[PDB]
Write an enzyme that holds these catalytic residues in place. Sequence first.
Site, PDB file in Angstrom:
ATOM      1  N   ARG A 126      -1.964 -15.977   2.202  1.00 53.55           N
ATOM      2  CA  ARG A 126      -2.941 -15.499   3.175  1.00 53.55           C
ATOM      3  C   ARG A 126      -2.499 -15.814   4.597  1.00 53.55           C
ATOM      4  O   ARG A 126      -2.676 -14.998   5.506  1.00 53.55           O
ATOM      5  CB  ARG A 126      -4.311 -16.116   2.899  1.00 53.55           C
ATOM      6  CG  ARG A 126      -5.060 -15.481   1.751  1.00 53.55           C
ATOM      7  CD  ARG A 126      -6.426 -16.115   1.575  1.00 53.55           C
ATOM      8  NE  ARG A 126      -7.403 -15.564   2.505  1.00 53.55           N
ATOM      9  CZ  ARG A 126      -7.801 -16.169   3.614  1.00 53.55           C
ATOM     10  NH1 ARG A 126      -7.328 -17.353   3.963  1.00 53.55           N
ATOM     11  NH2 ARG A 126      -8.693 -15.570   4.394  1.00 53.55           N
ATOM     12  N   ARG A 138       1.131  -7.987   8.893  1.00 51.05           N
ATOM     13  CA  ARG A 138       0.199  -6.917   9.223  1.00 51.05           C
ATOM     14  C   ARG A 138       0.309  -6.464  10.671  1.00 51.05           C
ATOM     15  O   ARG A 138      -0.077  -5.332  10.980  1.00 51.05           O
ATOM     16  CB  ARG A 138      -1.227  -7.360   8.923  1.00 51.05           C
ATOM     17  CG  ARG A 138      -1.535  -7.417   7.444  1.00 51.05           C
ATOM     18  CD  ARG A 138      -2.853  -8.100   7.179  1.00 51.05           C
ATOM     19  NE  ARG A 138      -3.398  -7.746   5.877  1.00 51.05           N
ATOM     20  CZ  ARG A 138      -4.083  -8.573   5.105  1.00 51.05           C
ATOM     21  NH1 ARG A 138      -4.304  -9.827   5.463  1.00 51.05           N
ATOM     22  NH2 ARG A 138      -4.554  -8.136   3.944  1.00 51.05           N
ATOM     23  N   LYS A 154       0.823  -1.194   0.000  1.00 53.36           N
ATOM     24  CA  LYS A 154       0.000   0.000   0.000  1.00 53.36           C
ATOM     25  C   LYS A 154       0.866   1.257   0.000  1.00 53.36           C
ATOM     26  O   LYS A 154       2.037   1.213   0.381  1.00 53.36           O
ATOM     27  CB  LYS A 154      -0.925  -0.015   1.214  1.00 53.36           C
ATOM     28  CG  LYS A 154      -2.081  -0.987   1.086  1.00 53.36           C
ATOM     29  CD  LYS A 154      -3.074  -0.797   2.211  1.00 53.36           C
ATOM     30  CE  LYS A 154      -4.249  -1.741   2.073  1.00 53.36           C
ATOM     31  NZ  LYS A 154      -5.074  -1.410   0.884  1.00 53.36           N
ATOM     32  N   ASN A 212      -3.676  -1.622   6.680  1.00 55.27           N
ATOM     33  CA  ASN A 212      -3.037  -2.827   7.203  1.00 55.27           C
ATOM     34  C   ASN A 212      -1.710  -3.165   6.526  1.00 55.27           C
ATOM     35  O   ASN A 212      -1.176  -4.240   6.808  1.00 55.27           O
ATOM     36  CB  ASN A 212      -3.995  -4.010   7.081  1.00 55.27           C
ATOM     37  CG  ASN A 212      -4.730  -4.025   5.764  1.00 55.27           C
ATOM     38  OD1 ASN A 212      -5.952  -3.919   5.722  1.00 55.27           O
ATOM     39  ND2 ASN A 212      -3.987  -4.160   4.675  1.00 55.27           N
ATOM     40  N   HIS A 217      -1.778  -6.216   0.923  1.00 55.00           N
ATOM     41  CA  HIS A 217      -3.032  -6.759   0.427  1.00 55.00           C
ATOM     42  C   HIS A 217      -2.760  -8.052  -0.327  1.00 55.00           C
ATOM     43  O   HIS A 217      -1.840  -8.116  -1.146  1.00 55.00           O
ATOM     44  CB  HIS A 217      -3.738  -5.761  -0.483  1.00 55.00           C
ATOM     45  CG  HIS A 217      -4.877  -6.350  -1.252  1.00 55.00           C
ATOM     46  ND1 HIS A 217      -6.107  -6.598  -0.684  1.00 55.00           N
ATOM     47  CD2 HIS A 217      -4.970  -6.746  -2.541  1.00 55.00           C
ATOM     48  CE1 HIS A 217      -6.910  -7.118  -1.593  1.00 55.00           C
ATOM     49  NE2 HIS A 217      -6.246  -7.218  -2.729  1.00 55.00           N
TER      50      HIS A 217
END
Lengths: 52, 419, 162, 48, 430, 332
Positions: free
Chosen positions: F277, F297, F200, F307, F310
């Site tokens: 994940r 995270r 991000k 967070n 992604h």
Amino acid sequence: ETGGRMMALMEQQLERAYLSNVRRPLGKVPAAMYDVQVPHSGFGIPSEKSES
Amino acid sequence: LYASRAKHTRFKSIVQRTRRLLCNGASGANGIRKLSRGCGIAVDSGGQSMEKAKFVEALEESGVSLDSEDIEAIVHVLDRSGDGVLDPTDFIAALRRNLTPLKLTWITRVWYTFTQSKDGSVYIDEVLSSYNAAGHPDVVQNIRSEQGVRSEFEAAFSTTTNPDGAITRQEFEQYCSGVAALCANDLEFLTLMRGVWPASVRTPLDEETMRTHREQNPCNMTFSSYQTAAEKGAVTDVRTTVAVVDDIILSSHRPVVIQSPLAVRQLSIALRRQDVQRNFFLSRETFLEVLRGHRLYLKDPESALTVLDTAGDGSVDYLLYMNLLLPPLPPARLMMLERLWELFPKDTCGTADVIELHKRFSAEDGEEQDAFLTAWDVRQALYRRFTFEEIVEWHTPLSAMFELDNDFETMLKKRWDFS
Amino acid sequence: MIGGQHKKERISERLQNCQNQPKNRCYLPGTQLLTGGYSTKTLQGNWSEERADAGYYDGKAIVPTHLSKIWTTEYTVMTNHAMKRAQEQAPVFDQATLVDIVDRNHRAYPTHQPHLDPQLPKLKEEAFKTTMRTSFNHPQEVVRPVIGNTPAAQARAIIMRF
Amino acid sequence: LDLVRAKHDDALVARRQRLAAMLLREKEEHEAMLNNLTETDEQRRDRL
Amino acid sequence: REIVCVQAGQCGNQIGSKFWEVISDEHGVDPTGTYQGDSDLQLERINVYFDEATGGRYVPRSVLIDLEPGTMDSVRAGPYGQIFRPDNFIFGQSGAGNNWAKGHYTEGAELIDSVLDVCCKEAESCDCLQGFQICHSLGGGTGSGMGTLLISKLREQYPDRIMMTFSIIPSPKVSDTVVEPYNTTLSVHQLVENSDESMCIDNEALYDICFRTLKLTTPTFGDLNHLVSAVVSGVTCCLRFPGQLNSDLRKLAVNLVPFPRLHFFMMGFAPLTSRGSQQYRGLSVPELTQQMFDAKNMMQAADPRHGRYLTASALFRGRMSTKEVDEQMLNVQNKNSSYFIEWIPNNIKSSVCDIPPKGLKMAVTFIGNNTCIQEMFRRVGEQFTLMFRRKAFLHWYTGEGMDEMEFTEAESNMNDLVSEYQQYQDATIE
Amino acid sequence: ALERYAFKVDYCDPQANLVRQYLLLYFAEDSTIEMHDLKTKRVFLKRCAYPSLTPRELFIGATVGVFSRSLKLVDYGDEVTRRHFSGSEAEFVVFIQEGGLCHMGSIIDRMHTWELRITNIRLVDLPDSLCRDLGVSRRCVAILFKGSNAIEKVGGLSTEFPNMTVVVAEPSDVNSVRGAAFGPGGTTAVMKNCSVCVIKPHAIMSGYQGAIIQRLIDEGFHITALGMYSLTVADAEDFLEVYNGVVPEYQRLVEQMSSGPCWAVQVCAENSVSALRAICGPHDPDVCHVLFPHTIRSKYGVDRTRNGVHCTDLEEDAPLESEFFFSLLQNA
Ligand SMILES: Nc1nc2c(ncn2[C@@H]2O[C@H](COP(=O)(O)OP(=O)(O)O)[C@@H](O)[C@H]2O)c(=O)[nH]1
């Protein structure tokens, strides 16, 4: 400041061990200290029957 | 008290990373076996004790580096006595069983194709002769040649690796776990295992049905930017069917069976009795009739049974169904149960007698004795013989009642003998 | 339906460069269905009728937030047991039917919502029936009372029928 | 053209449903992991 | 049921900026005006204080008035200042000069028509109008003169609505200005005729709250205005959230004022406690009630122990039992029975609201009508009498144009207010 | 250092759909800021303390957040600042050869510790002509960067990492590699058995990017593609279609992803989507800080909107996201 949701959940988890929260909850009957079984028809003696 | 659960999650991540790192190095599929050889393990399921510093230097020379916090997590999970000593077989077991249920199902299926000895071992000559390198998908697509894969497999199992000449179940599972970590997903593993070990499937089928089943697999159905409407709908249908079957099994069928060992044992007997080829396959109507007699039901049999068909012919794989139905056990408890299994003589197909179970049991109350005698009836057993999976399924509901492994240790010592 | 996707701009509207008020669909920036000077989230004006629409959607995420759990009303606590059971089932439409609902195609009057009528299929089968055709068919082709809502009464009636 | 667009929006909505179900399941699973983070007197007596 | 706010002078504008910060936070409004809240309960009564502009944004129904733009430019320049509507800022070109007569008679009448035009524009747009809310100081110049002028005009135009004022008044302990008694006397004369309910706060009490209760090392005027904004936003809470026993400004007035001149009230807010101490004591209705009646927690210099309560009201926010509330209010009334006026059978009203302020499990705001307020007015009247006998600074006011007869009238009316409060304190049932 | 910085910034107004310009001043002696309006010549904000803003983040092309507004620094508004940034405007290229792909995260982290700003990055395979002329391998990572005293700082990579970095300073070679390495063309991303992780913008400005990439390498994953792209509002909406109506922070995610440039990586491993994940962690950092303290995270996230990273959730969309990042954005 509130430390989010996990801290709040653990905070409420540490609370119920208090005697006041056990014997004085909000709008509830205090919990039982042993298991009880509700009969199918409910509590109380059934009415006694007689011959026609 | 969340430090313990943080440690447990860290242990799971450690197992994941260790499995990926070992299989990506110089020795791809042989990483776990090399790790076991380096750690000094000489008995397949022995209780040899090894101190922490030697374990961490063994992992260091294997190719995995751990700092203080991962060492602490590993010690916390594995050391069940607090004496500063641990058993590396638990870590190897954790590396061994880290697979999806389909992979475990087919790995178990291949193992029973062999001929077992008096003590559960399998000779090296049989496994060398039963390998078929011509059907390797690497060879068929013509990237490499047959001689290369034959030579690498022969280097995997040779007289310098195993001087005695017999392979245990644990060694074969370690090798298969190694070769599984290189495949992309489940379909690649199925293709490799079918091509390489041909005796696993009992009857052949034409290429048309095989290619139609391969094209409809969930792995190949996946979205893209330039899709048309009909093929998007096809992907949607496949994914929805898989999700509905998984959640209906987990939400409905598990609560019925998991509450008692008797139900699990009776369902296993009912499923296994109808099998005549002993290859863990059944027809659709037989499967539905077996499930109807045990108060388990489906809302749409045609759509629901399309995901338990891992052979492509319309049959039902009940080994996969039982794997999805019951939850896996922690590796330490599996080691305990395998130490119990070591004390039984075995026949040519890998079974033991029920009298052996009967003379090694010691209950305390009358109810548990009644349940044990009812579940392990001599008349209800298939041919007076039982397998290891039946023991695992029987002990699974009992293992859910305890949170610490020391309690499971104590219960096992009380109920059983020696182990 | 979840995420809207039927309140958004369509490709035909974008290609034709359609404006807002001829069809009065509030999707263009600066236009919104304002009831009483406010959005439908605020309890002013005609919010109850606009919330009764077939195409209405409320912007509530499925994944809940923390302050929703913290801030609850006493009435909600009283009536939450029935709400959990009542939230299990709800009617659903596909996208073509939602296009038809938004475009309000087949209606007797502007507020007629036939897709919310549970007796629509039997009405459709019942349509185009004449009195004589029903009443003058081929002549060849054409209980002890039990009182109470008690389950014993139902059992007795069923046993008598059997 | 509008009809074909609806045909694509169907699959979009289906993906949204699957994601929502998975996320709700995970969120419920996480909160049950805090249930028994308590210490009883029996374990303390055992240590002593 | 929407309120219109008016903020006048430096003190009023400063308190208002903090009030609109607190209100925007409780309803989750970003300082850009975009809604960013996290529950539907926030949106469903937003109309009460905000109007909706096109798109996302919401705009607050407030009129800003001042005689020199320095303060107004400071509030517009502040971090939430942008939310305010540009046309709502009204200002002149020269100061009040700390003179009541200037603020009321010369520049007041010059500006006042544009303020009424804005207030009327805002009121007639409402679907149903609730009372007005005004913040100002009585000791100042522009605060006193235009606040009381505007109050009189709004009372002429909306006599059927509610009139509510929050007012800061001069203490003798720490004065900032020499001519405070004149301005205070004239303003109290105007308020007692025009107002329906008037709330009074002493800066000395806010300093003692900060130093003794909160143990702040270096409090600032932002803190005092935050405490005031907390009580102001608390009194209106039942208008805009659900609850087990709803209440309303009109219901407060009907239960608190026995006779129409007796409309001056004390304020308090209960869960005040220092960050070091908060780990040591949980919130509960007995604890809140004990802080609520403790004179330590009241925002005026007069203490309840020298008077008697005619009436009081407590508004509780949070999830709590009604039995405990009723019996606590009964026990306090029974145990301290000499401090409650005996010819009224029950002096306390309670109200319960489901939604607490953010970051507190529960809160209560307390409003009290007590005769000890007479000592404050008496003190101001003493300083006026000392100054007036010698014509100490009167030529400024007379030069603006006031007749001396206004000063004797204002003194007589304030003295009569003190007499009316004192007679009911010292009386028997007969 | 400085006594006062001065920049002019643009703010994209979502309600008005205009672009507004302001003047931002930073006083370094006591860490206070103040904003003025150029179009009106009026004050926008007094001198107010703002401790989250530091002099290190002030450079051209950066993004900052002041009272829930995203401001993008555009141009110098004063000649003191222009003279202080007289350098730091020349763009150079540092390559990483085949032997250095395992150490690329540490290289990027070392560049960030040296006050160097990366203006582009990509994983490419060069034509043979540039391969012979420059002296690099076939498969390499091209990093474009600028900063103060750049050449003297990057000389330390020759001794920290022996024989895996090539530095380019001549403008002609820089122009040739800019034309060749970046720009429209092909990509090395696979189309099956892959996963996509996105860094991000806030983590980009804070600069944990090297640690994230090196953690991915350490865990055992393979990087098959990498690049930096800037997302428009519509692109951000089309990237997060599946998150509409599911998570409560959809619009905040849209504005965060449209705020500035973002890095996108591709990961290939066994059961790639589930593994990524698991390594990234749950969506909410609060759960991470209690039950998953080792996840990415937990270290690089503060709330649900920000967070840090992604990752793909549904295994049906991994080629879709890979295509959207490495073909639609890159090629056109
Ligand atoms: N509580 C509080 N009191 C204030 C504030 N600003 C000024 N005051 C007080 O109000 C009085 C000065 O009145 P002022 O507002 O200047 O009157 P004006 O000139 O007519 O606006 C003094 O007692 C100040 O201490 C504030 O922000 N909060």
